[PDB]
Design a protein around this ligand. Structure first.
Ligand SMILES: Cc1cc2nc3c(=O)[nH]c(=O)nc-3n(C[C@H](O)[C@H](O)[C@H](O)COP(=O)(O)OP(=O)(O)OC[C@H]3O[C@@H](n4cnc5c(N)ncnc54)[C@H](O)[C@@H]3O)c2cc1C
Ligand SMILES: Cc1cc2nc3c(=O)[nH]c(=O)nc-3n(C[C@H](O)[C@H](O)[C@H](O)COP(=O)(O)OP(=O)(O)OC[C@H]3O[C@@H](n4cnc5c(N)ncnc54)[C@H](O)[C@@H]3O)c2cc1C
Ligand SMILES: COc1nc2ccccc2nc1CCC(=O)O
Ligand SMILES: COc1nc2ccccc2nc1CCC(=O)O
Ligand SMILES: [K+]
Ligand SMILES: [K+]
Lengths: 589, 589
């Protein structure tokens, strides 16, 4: 293992120093490198149990077993005397910059994964380029650096969710003694969008500054991988050039799908357009039943919108269906209409968007229900939320030899390596991985450390917690109840559950027995918690800490022995006792 | 162990059935007991690794080793034939009700611990009485069943905190696009108190119904333990009688202290009076620096109050002092005034409370600073928050033989047993234990199960998480940084930390680099997390789940391997990297 590790580490590191913490010669090299502004990885052999074995293996590359040893791009450069020789002769700059390639790393895609990977790689002296380009939506929407989450995903969706939550805060404030005339209070969509877009603008700028401050080259250019080490770039002026890189990270993400019906591309919008929409959507139809569809429907209804969701089959396919039903029931009871078992056939235009006075157009949506009844209703805005897909050319990928699956996603090893050994894929294009921002960031930063700092830690994609930011939020970590029963059998599954009522909801006259949580446990494995599920306010804050306990193998007894914090929603997890097998109601007084 | 356990279990259980899950004779006894409405504990010997040993030990009490075996108050009553004989002869009711004592359990105190203990004991057929009496405050305030938390603690404090948070929600709503004229919005104290008191009233009633539905006797009476098994009760009419009990649970809690200065008792109030105060406090002085003092000052300031806190030395003594400073700094920057290194000398009355128009009086407070300067300022309300103390007669406790410490709290074994072996103490009077509602409830329910259902599980009082519901909340679990350094030495402690900014605060134009979290870790124990600390919104929701991971022995690597939920405040715990030893700033972009 030690020999294989050392060979890979030496081959891939841009600039790396083998050192010991107590080694004055090591300190002298560190001081020279720091004076010369040369960034590098450092491995302290006296902080590794196999450090003595590593020292002996180093002689296979350098012919010495002493520290310090400095390497550049797979070549031993010297001990302390040799490094100080290069410095004193003004040779050291030329040596640490010598490469077959323009860059140690080229990241194609400046989103959650690619910016994380690029910034982290640059810290170890990898000469890094990040390419980002935002192909416009069909109506011409575009945005700045930072990817889906920053511009058209997690950040603006959660801000618009917060504007929706503040609706309920205005209602609650009267019950808690605040004197306000709600009959005279309205929401202004464009004022909210201006706020959200000013924050996004601060992130676009922040990322450009962060790349500049890490000596990363940012190119606003479309990248195409044309051979293992060569990236063709096309700038805004349609000027084409080629740059070369040692390691390549594909981090190009996905874009919204459209249904293949007349009028969809011409008259509908997607989440890409919604978060900067210059006009209030008005009476809205959301087609789809993903977390995006329900999140978007939810905040638009809480901002005073007339909202309908058109659902082909079920809500939140792949999530726990009991929890998905409760999420949708809350929405239907709080102002969202559902056209269930219904699909669209055509969108017709009745009015064009007013691009001068910022008002929506008008659309006729024709569809049909499974019962044979026609759907025909006017909406001001139609939002498709029917899935996202990667944008890689299947032909070009095959030419370079990067394997894709039938969905067009990249087939990777558990260390993000593609079938082209210097090329890696992270984030939403990595086939089979949870499509989440913190996953892409951990994958990118951990990969950068393996490539350029001799790290071994892999990303753990198991039991990744999530939250759906519907009007009543849904947090989960681990298996759905149905998936646990399919895997282990009904006889080996115990489910503990309870309704609960936030204290905040009492004086506000909100519902009893609507917030709900459950633990899905394995009887034969000491009642191991396989799945945790919570429907309630602040569900992401609730869920996150339990994700650490589940990663560690938490059992029901671990939950029971922990004392609650009172008064909280989360403390209910520490006192669950009603099982589903008992048939006793989970409702509470 | 098995023999000692069985003897204690048989001696203390009111009604207990030794059974096996697959035992038709056992089912017949269960069916008779259920028909006769006889509640009991059940131990299924085939669900215990030492069940076969227990069966053999049972013959020391019953002369048989078969199941079922039924016991009442330490006496073997019969196998299946004998129990059906008693039933068929109408003798079984008289047998299961025969005792030397009126009650199996008398709980003195109907608060967090005592109601938890009493309800749980009654489930196993313990004939239970709960005594509760609320001695009026000096101004005559009293309230109903449920104890400090329900009436004058956690429940109303967190509701008034929520009313305060909704102030900030009104401010935030304008930035998120809501059109409201804040210059015309005011708070009505009495409307909020009416809401809070209607919820408390629903809990007072709920508890009385819950005790009735568990066949618990509720006496609104002051109890005094006059011998190990005899409780003298004094009813509202000053009528005195004696009831007897097998087990006694002392669960009498604490009441606020007053400083020994002129005017304090006559003109000041405490948290006991604040939560039902019929008039707005108006310009308020809070004397003290406990979590109660700061929680109360905090919500009164957010409800438009002119509030000053008079601090003798430090804030939140016994909490992490870095975190206490940040808590107080946030308050001082958001409308709370602090009179630091100051003590009161006298309260003089300037105006009497208007009990007809619900307005406060007026008070002159005279005190002094450590620098020798006089304090002399008028306030409408003066709230003392200078500590709480138990109310047990030191003389009577000595007469029965219940040992108290120098603070008047009860000295208990790790199973809540006092120096009088049938008498137990739970909750705030249990010397050395965290004074928290969920602690009292877990202690009471776990004790009831040991007394009456043969349970062995003890309450774990280690690493109990807390939250201070100041305007910016502070959640913690485990050691303060200073206490970790005192225990293990500075060289063995590593502290990871970061500022952070809630996404909710961006568009709302709230502060960068004010919310803050840290992990206090032990270097020599695999970077074991000794203490977790977070200052930010929803800090109780954030902290609770990590308390399970800390109970399980979480390390920094456990935190790092877990993936964040985005966008949340809690996810910052999964990506901490800045150490205090590095000297690198914890501020973030
Ligand atoms: C509406 C919505 C809400 C979401 N909410 C959440 C949430 O709350 N929490 C969460 O964790 N996740 C959420 N997600 C998922 C999250 O946005 C993604 O998992 C994350 O953005 C994926 O990051 P990535 O680096 O794979 O790609 P992206 O962030 O999509 O970045 C890829 C970038 O590469 C660019 N690019 C594409 N092709 C090229 C090319 N040839 N050359 C150069 N650049 C190119 C793209 O235009 C883009 O800028 C949400 C997604 C959406 C759509
Ligand atoms: C302002 C404030 C805020 C708090 N906030 C929180 C918080 O947010 N979270 C938290 O976990 N904890 C909080 N606490 C602590 C919590 O209230 C206590 O830890 C908890 O109430 C203790 O329960 P207990 O059963 O020991 O006693 P108590 O709840 O005090 O109940 C004891 C009862 O016995 C009665 N009694 C006394 N003597 C006799 C007698 N001789 N005969 C009969 N009855 C008698 C008392 O009047 C009372 O009704 C707070 C406390 C205060 C004061
Ligand atoms: C994963 O996407 C789907 N998978 C399915 C599998 C089996 C049957 C139907 C399915 N429908 C969808 C996507 C749209 C929908 O939820 O109806
Ligand atoms: C625990 O209560 C205190 N302990 C102290 C110990 C040593 C020195 C002073 C102390 N003061 C208080 C209570 C009031 C205060 O915080 O000043
Ligand atoms: K518990
Ligand atoms: K992490």
């Amino acid at each position: 293992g030690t020999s294989q590790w050392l060979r890979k580490t030496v081959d891939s590191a841009a600039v790396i120093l083998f050192s010991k913490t107590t080694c004055p010669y090591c300190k002298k090299v560190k001081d020279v490198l720091a004076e010369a502004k040369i960034k590098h990885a450092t491995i302290e052999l006296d902080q590794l149990s196999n450090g003595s074995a590593i020292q002996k293996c180093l002689a296979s590359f350098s012919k010495i077993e002493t520290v310090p040893q400095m390497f550049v791009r797979g070549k031993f450069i010297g001990d302390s005397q040799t490094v100080l020789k290069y410095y004193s002769n003004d040779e050291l700059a030329g040596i640490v910059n010598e490469s077959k390639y323009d860059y140690d790393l080229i990241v194609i895609g400046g989103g959650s994964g690619g910016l994380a990977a690029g910034k982290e790689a640059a810290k170890y002296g990898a000469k890094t380029a990040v390419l980002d380009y935002v192909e416009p939506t069909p109506i011409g929407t575009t945005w700045g650096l930072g990817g889906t989450c920053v511009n058209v995903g997690c950040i603006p969706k959660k801000l618009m969710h917060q504007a929706g939550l503040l609706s309920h805060a205005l209602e609650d404030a009267e019950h808690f003694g605040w004197s306000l005339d709600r009959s005279k209070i309205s929401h202004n969509w464009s004022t909210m969008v201006e706020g959200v877009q000013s924050h996004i603008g601060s992130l676009n700028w922040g990322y450009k500054v962060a790349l500049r401050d890490n000596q990363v080259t940012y190119l606003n250019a479309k990248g195409r991988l044309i051979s293992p080490h060569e990236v063709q770039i096309t700038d805004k002026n349609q000027k084409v050039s080629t740059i070369t890189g040692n390691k390549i990270i594909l981090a190009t993400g996905e874009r919204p799908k459209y249904p293949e019906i007349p009028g969809a591309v011409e008259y509908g919008i997607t989440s890409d357009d919604l978060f900067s929409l210059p006009y209030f959507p008005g009476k809205t139809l959301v087609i789809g039943a993903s977390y995006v569809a329900l999140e978007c429907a939810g905040f638009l209804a809480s901002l005073g919108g007339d909202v309908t969701v058109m659902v082909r089959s079920i809500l939140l396919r792949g999530f726990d269906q009991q929890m998905a039903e409760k999420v949708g029931d809350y929405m239907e009871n709080h102002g969202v209409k559902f056209a269930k078992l219904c699909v669209p056939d055509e969108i017709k235009q009745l009015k064009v968007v007013d691009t001068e006075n910022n008002k929506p157009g008008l659309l006729l949506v024709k569809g049909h229900y499974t019962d044979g009844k026609k759907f025909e209703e006017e909406f001001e805005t139609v939002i498709f939320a029917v899935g996202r897909e990667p944008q890689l050319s299947k032909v070009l990928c095959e030419t370079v030899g990067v394997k894709l699956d039938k969905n067009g996603r990249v087939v990777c090893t558990d260390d993000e390596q593609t079938t082209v050994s210097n090329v890696y894929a992270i984030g939403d294009i990595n086939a089979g991985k949870p499509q989440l921002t913190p996953v892409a960031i951990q994958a990118g930063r951990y990969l950068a450390r393996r490539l350029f700092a001799g790290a071994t830690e892999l990303t753990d994609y198991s039991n990744v917690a999530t939250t759906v930011f519907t009007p009543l939020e849904y947090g989960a970590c681990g298996l759905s109840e149905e998936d646990a029963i399919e895997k282990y059998g009904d006889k080996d599954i115990e489910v503990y559950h309870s309704n609960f009522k936030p204290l905040e909801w009492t004086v506000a006259h909100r519902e009893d027995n609507v917030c709900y949580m459950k633990l899905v446990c394995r009887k034969s494995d000491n009642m191991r918690v396989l799945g945790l599920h919570v429907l309630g306010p602040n569900a992401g804050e609730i869920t996150q800490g339990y994700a650490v306990a589940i990663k560690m193998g938490a059992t029901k007894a671990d939950f029971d022995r922990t004392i609650g914090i009172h008064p909280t929603c989360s403390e209910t997890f520490t006192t669950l006792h009603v099982t589903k097998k008992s048939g006793v109601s989970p409702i509470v007084s």
